[PDB]
Amino acid sequence: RKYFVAANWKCNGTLESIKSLTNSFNNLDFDPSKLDVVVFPVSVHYDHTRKLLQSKFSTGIQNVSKFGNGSYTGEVSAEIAKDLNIEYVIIGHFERRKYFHETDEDVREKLQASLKNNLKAVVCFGESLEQREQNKTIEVITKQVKAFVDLIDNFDNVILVYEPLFAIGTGKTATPEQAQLVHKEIRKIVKDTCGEKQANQIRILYGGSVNTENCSSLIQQEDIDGFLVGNASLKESFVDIIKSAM
Amino acid sequence: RKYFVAANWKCNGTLESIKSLTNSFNNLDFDPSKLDVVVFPVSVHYDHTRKLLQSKFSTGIQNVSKFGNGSYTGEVSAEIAKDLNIEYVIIGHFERRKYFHETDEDVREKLQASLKNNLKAVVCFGESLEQREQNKTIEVITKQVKAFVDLIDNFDNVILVYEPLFAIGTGKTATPEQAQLVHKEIRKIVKDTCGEKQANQIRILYGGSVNTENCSSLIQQEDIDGFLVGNASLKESFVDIIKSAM
């Protein structure tokens, strides 16, 4: 599979910090046909970022609407994203499920709208600490994946992201071995629900804590095909995380 | 009071449609020092819209985060808006309260964040059809306004918007008289919770259904200082709605 490394800048950035960061990113020489590198800036920063980043870099937005064009103040439709040639969208990030009541139904409808408008989707999911200590990690993940997996028609255009909530921002850390076990189970879900070819084709990214010191140990795992990097993607050192996948 | 006519494009527009519409708007000759005219495009359309619209037109975004910069995927903070020199933000539009569980406390926190970052805010509120039938219009409005009114420091920087949900997509219609009665009460609420001088200077816009056919009858009301226009702001004739306030 083609590795995929993404920068989720979340809600961070200034016109000037973006100029400096994008310049640093542009200095990295990589072949976009061998590895996908996607930058996800804040909506109002998209134009600025797309222009500053060299073409080898792909771009996208951090959220998209399940409603199409219409009376939906504050939303960005997949139709609008398509008209702007925004290539990727992130769906179901745990922060939107946590702070903005995003549900599995929302995730499903957002993925459908995205695919219908030729957008590629980075779909996130993951179990909570309570669910993990209750031994329902796979039960939870299966339900979350099955809420939308049947919508995937082209397995190069949808990228899955496992987010180990118990090890994100908690000080706790998930081992590469623990990550791998979950990633292998996720691929099996795709295999049983969709097919073996489809399962072996789809990219499953690790969306937990990723930095320059652990990226190599993670990307090395058989079922981890890249990362959805958070705050670490706001540092120039993000280029070293990208290099671990080259 | 300086009249205020705002265009809420909601989730509509393509690069080309915006080009055509903005050209039409730029044809209108008005004095920005005598009248405020603000256009609120979709977040990803902001750069395009701002460059196309002549300086006489003010611009803003349809929503802002209740959080500051940080790990809030998909949100646009007040700080980011300030850095981009975005002048206005709409807060509490009924569509966000309807579809995205936005609460009075969310509106409060968003107003506080906006004001802290020198942004001007267009804050919406209004009662539902059931509440009006229960004769609780003023009760509801009073609670919604008191949820954030104490945060207002400069009364030229916060603009209120009354949205009669009972007359929005319900077949029913809100009359200028009914609107004037509510606006007068809203201003009284600001007078009795803040001060008389503050109440006399704050703009209170009508956010119900506004078109070329009823805009004059609305702006004529003594306590109606402009409007937040929806679908009618997507047509060239929006210029005639602006003219009604000139």
UniProtKB/Swiss-Prot annotation, chains A, B:
Outcome, altering residue 94 to A: 2-fold decrease in substrate affinity
Reactions listed under catalytic activity: D-glyceraldehyde 3-phosphate = dihydroxyacetone phosphate
Pathway where it operates: Carbohydrate biosynthesis; gluconeogenesis; Carbohydrate degradation; glycolysis; D-glyceraldehyde 3-phosphate from glycerone phosphate: step 1/1
Positions with a binding annotation for D-glyceraldehyde 3-phosphate: 8, 10, 169, 228, 230-231
Any single Gene Ontology cellular-component annotation: cytosol
Keywords: Gluconeogenesis, Glycolysis, Isomerase
An annotated Gene Ontology molecular function: triose-phosphate isomerase activity
Phosphoprotein is among the record's keywords: no
Phenotype upon changing residue 94 to Y: 5-fold decrease in substrate affinity
InterPro entries in alphabetical order: Aldolase_TIM, TIM_sf, TrioseP_Isoase_bac/euk, Triosephosphate_isomerase, Triosephosphate_isomerase_AS
Reported impact of residue 94 to W: 3-fold decrease in substrate affinity
Example GO BP: glycolytic process
Record Gene3D superfamilies: Aldolase class I
Residues annotated as the enzyme's active site: 93 (electrophile), 163 (proton acceptor)
EC number: 5.3.1.1
Mutagenesis or variant effect for residue 94 to S: 5.5-fold decrease in substrate affinity. 3-fold decrease in substrate affinity
Pfam family, one: TIM
Enzyme superclass (EC): isomerase
Family classification: Belongs to the triosephosphate isomerase family.
Subunit organization: Homodimer.
Function: Catalyzes the interconversion of glyceraldehyde 3-phosphate and dihydroxyacetone phosphate in the glycolytic and gluconeogenic pathways.
Name assigned to this protein: Triosephosphate isomerase
Species name: Plasmodium falciparum
Gene that specifies this protein: TPI
